[PDB]
């Protein structure tokens, strides 16, 4: 209710809004690379599964 208090509130809000958030692009790239890894491993397993019914890999 005092013009000093509101100015201090504005200053503290400006201080708090400048917090450095963590990097997110690399964080998501981690998940993307893990997805690629899992896909490759599952593809290897599926290919070796196919090599059981017949005696040759695809093509």
């Amino acid at each position: 209710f005092t013009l000093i208090e509101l100015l201090i509130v504005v200053a503290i809000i400006g201080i708090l809004a400048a917090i450095a958030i963590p990097q997110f692009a690399a964080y998501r790239q981690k998940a993307f690379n893990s997805a690629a890894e899992s896909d490759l491993k599952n593809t290897k397993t599926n290919l070796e599964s196919y090599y059981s019914e017949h005696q040759f890999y695809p093509n």
Binding site: A35, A36, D39, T43, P58, N59
Partner: protein, 92 residues
Amino acid sequence: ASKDVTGSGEIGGSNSTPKLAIQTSNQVTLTYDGGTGHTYGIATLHAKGTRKYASTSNDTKIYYNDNTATAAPSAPVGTATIGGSTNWKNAL
């Protein structure tokens, strides 16, 4: 050939051979080369990724390269390891 796949797709089928259906993850692209049929060469690269994992039938571990453009491992002609080549050997 080098029939790549993404999402859901089909692999092989030449000379009227049976063709299996490979379903990858959301938006991961997979490059496959079956050669004559004795061996296979696999590769993997996420669309918004920073690595290109790859392997082969004769190998025993997945190899990567931080270029996302290192072509793909062709089918090796007989018990030929791909881990050690110029486009690879950054062992996992």
